[PDB]
């Protein structure tokens, strides 16, 4: 509702809009793929987090080395049973602990389910996914993912600077 979550909501939409853009669907104006609000300089934190979010945004499973096909086949949802799916999503997302992995997983999966969900639920479904994504991530994930690092692991993934000065830097003094 109000805890510093503007850039987070604009980021998820940037990527989600990029995948959906191939089909031509956007809640902002049927076209955007950036933010349409944040308006960052793209070279200090927004370019670093955006570029790192993309690089790891496909490393969620890493060459598909975890499970089988389950992001397009069947796909069940409706106004009365979807509530069970959402409750399961967060509950299962708390398995090992809500971290930066939850963002990479919802990136590809959220776009792979959204393309089939919007086409099976009109443009009203995805329009909710954008708001619910912020309400859920802000409900109990913003402080959690950030408490463990979250964005810190993302930038270290695309930057490969995890073994430079981050290991012995924020593990004794900070």
């Amino acid at each position: 509702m109000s805890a510093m979550s503007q850039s987070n909501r604009e980021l998820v939409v940037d990527f989600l809009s990029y995948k959906l853009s191939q089909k031509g669907y956007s809640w902002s104006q049927f076209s955007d793929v950036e933010e349409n609000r944040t308006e960052a300089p793209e070279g200090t934190e927004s370019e670093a987090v955006k570029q790192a979010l993309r690089e790891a945004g496909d490393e969620f499973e890493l060459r598909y080395r975890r499970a089988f096909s389950d992001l397009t086949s069947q796909l069940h949802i409706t106004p009365g049973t979807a509530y069970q799916s959402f409750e399961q999503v967060v509950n299962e997302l708390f398995r090992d602990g809500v971290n930066w992995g939850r963002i990479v997983a919802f990136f590809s999966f959220g776009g792979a389910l959204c393309v089939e969900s919007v086409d099976k639920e009109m443009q009203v479904l995805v329009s909710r996914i954008a708001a619910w994504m912020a309400t859920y991530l802000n409900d109990h994930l913003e402080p959690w993912i950030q408490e463990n690092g979250g964005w810190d692991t993302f930038v270290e993934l695309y930057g490969n600077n995890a073994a430079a000065e981050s290991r012995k830097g924020q593990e004794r003094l900070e």
Binding site: F60, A82, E92, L93, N99, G101, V104, A105, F106, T153
Partner: peptide
Amino acid sequence: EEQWAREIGAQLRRMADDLNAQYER
């Protein structure tokens, strides 16, 4: 109810569980 929700949460957390690796998968 949502019987397919089993994968909507489990398969979602599955790949996301890679976070435990801490960048180093």
